[PDB]
Design an enzyme around this catalytic site. Structure first.
Site, PDB file in Angstrom:
ATOM      1  N   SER A  44       0.829  -1.200   0.000  1.00 49.17           N
ATOM      2  CA  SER A  44       0.000   0.000   0.000  1.00 49.17           C
ATOM      3  C   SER A  44       0.867   1.254   0.000  1.00 49.17           C
ATOM      4  CB  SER A  44      -0.939  -0.030   1.205  1.00 49.17           C
ATOM      5  OG  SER A  44      -1.701   1.153   1.300  1.00 49.17           O
ATOM      6  N   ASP A  51      -8.464  -2.806  -6.432  1.00 50.89           N
ATOM      7  CA  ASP A  51      -8.355  -3.933  -5.526  1.00 50.89           C
ATOM      8  C   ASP A  51      -9.227  -3.714  -4.293  1.00 50.89           C
ATOM      9  OD1 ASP A  51      -6.980  -2.063  -4.010  1.00 50.89           O
ATOM     10  OD2 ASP A  51      -5.174  -3.298  -3.794  1.00 50.89           O
ATOM     11  N   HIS A  81      -6.911  -5.583  -1.585  1.00 53.68           N
ATOM     12  CA  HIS A  81      -5.947  -4.828  -0.827  1.00 53.68           C
ATOM     13  C   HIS A  81      -5.584  -5.441   0.498  1.00 53.68           C
ATOM     14  CE1 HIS A  81      -4.062  -0.925   0.458  1.00 53.68           C
ATOM     15  NE2 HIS A  81      -3.733  -0.953  -0.835  1.00 53.68           N
TER      16      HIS A  81
END
Ligand SMILES: [Ca+2]
Ligand SMILES: [Zn+2]
Length: 392
Positions: free
Chosen positions: A111, A315, A356
């Site tokens: 991330s 995602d 994610h």
């Protein structure tokens, strides 16, 4: 295939916490287990950084630098004066004093961690001209981080990283939904958001801003103060750095080092609607993302902003198009992986069907062999050659 012995260091995004935080529920492994432990168990020496999840990539890199070699975080006198927070932060013993003796590391970043890792590499090598010039003009001391010349980083691997930002920040109710996401990760860890736990549980590490959860304060109440605090309202924030304009600004100075390998992984968990061109969450995507974030990501266009159709696959949190490497405002090169990893370029390692949170095990996905994923990456990193020579 082991050609280097550099250790691996793990780095979270806009959520993330230390191994001792969240009652031991791991950001890196989630409900799947303990990724660092798996790597260590498999002969890959691995460590974990914990930095301000909501803080700017700058602050987090300063924090990471001090967390690696030891000492008191130094955000730089110019930066601190600019944004109105403390120049000095918390003190760290240092995870890897070997770095002060020529050693190097592989960083695996998830991330926004991908932005932070890239930035750290840049400050390590280049330092900051602004800080140097500010130190000479004001006669203030200067952190070695800003001098340049440090080469601690043999590789940076980013997973689901918003190198070009994520359009999630554009949601009209983004501030309320962003913190609901924090609440959803807490929930994943079996931690309630409406309970004034007396133990820290989840430290947002806002030492520079002087913000911290108070006694009798639940995370719900805490987040309501954070929303109105400078870690949410300033440009010196994850919120700004996560935005498309903010990521572009970052890309304009945070370049790939020719001395360092870069790997990107793209994640996606959506399907395309034939009649709308929009992207939609699949079955299996974390519940919070599926309902609150994926629909927006998969439908939000803005010609003004540069967001056209390519941006919609996502995602759950980040636009897939953002993930292969920085592009917007970036001079970095990105190549598809062709069997051989090359220096000073983004090696797009491909696109994986995981959301994610699934990719770090925080959301379940028994179809995703997460253990194999990280083990294969560790092998790949350990195979990176220190040196190269031209041949036919
Ligand atoms: Ca899932
Ligand atoms: Zn700052």
């Amino acid at each position: 295939s082991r050609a280097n012995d550099a250790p691996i260091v793990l780095l979270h995004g806009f959520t993330g916490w230390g191994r001792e935080e969240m009652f031991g529920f791991k950001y890196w492994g989630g409900v799947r287990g303990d990724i660092e432990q798996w790597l260590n168990d498999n002969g890959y020496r691995t460590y974990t950084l914990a930095v301000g999840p909501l803080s700017s990539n700058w602050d987090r890199a300063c924090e990471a630098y001090a967390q690696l070699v030891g000492g008191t975080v130094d955000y730089g006198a110019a930066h601190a004066a600019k944004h109105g927070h403390a120049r000095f932060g918390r003190t760290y013993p240092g995870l890897l004093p070997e770095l002060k003796r020529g050693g190097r590391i592989h960083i695996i970043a998830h991330s926004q961690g991908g932005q932070t890792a890239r930035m750290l590499v840049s400050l390590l090598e280049n330092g900051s001209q602004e800080e140097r010039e500010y130190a000479k003009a004001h006669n203030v001391s200067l952190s070695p981080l800003f001098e340049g010349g440090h080469h601690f980083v043999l590789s940076v691997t980013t997973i689901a990283t918003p190198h070009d930002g994520t359009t999630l920040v554009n949601m009209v109710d983004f501030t309320d939904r962003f913190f609901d996401l924090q609440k959803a990760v807490l929930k994943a860890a079996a931690v309630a958001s409406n309970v004034p736990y007396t133990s820290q549980v989840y430290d947002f590490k806002l030492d520079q801003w002087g913000l911290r959860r108070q006694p009798g304060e639940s995370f719900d109440q805490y987040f309501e103060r954070l929303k109105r605090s400078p870690v949410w309202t300033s440009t010196d924030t994850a919120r700004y750095d996560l935005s498309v304009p903010g990521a572009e600004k970052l890309n304009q100075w945070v370049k790939a080092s020719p001395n360092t390998y870069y790997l990107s992984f793209t994640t996606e968990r959506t399907y395309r609607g034939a009649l709308t061109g929009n992207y939609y969450p699949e079955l299996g995507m974390n519940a919070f993302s599926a309902v609150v974030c994926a629909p927006f990501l998969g439908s939000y266009r803005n010609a003004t902003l540069g967001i056209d159709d390519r941006w919609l696959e996502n995602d759950g949190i980040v636009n897939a198009f953002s993930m292969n490497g920085p592009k917007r405002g970036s001079t970095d090169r990105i190549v598809p992986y062709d069997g051989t990893i090359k220096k000073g370029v983004w090696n797009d390692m491909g696109t994986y069907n995981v959301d994610h949170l699934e990719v770090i095990g925080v959301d379940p996905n028994p179809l995703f062999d997460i253990r194999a994923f990280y083990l294969r990456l560790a092998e790949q990193l350990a195979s990176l050659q220190p040196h190269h020579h031209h041949h036919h």
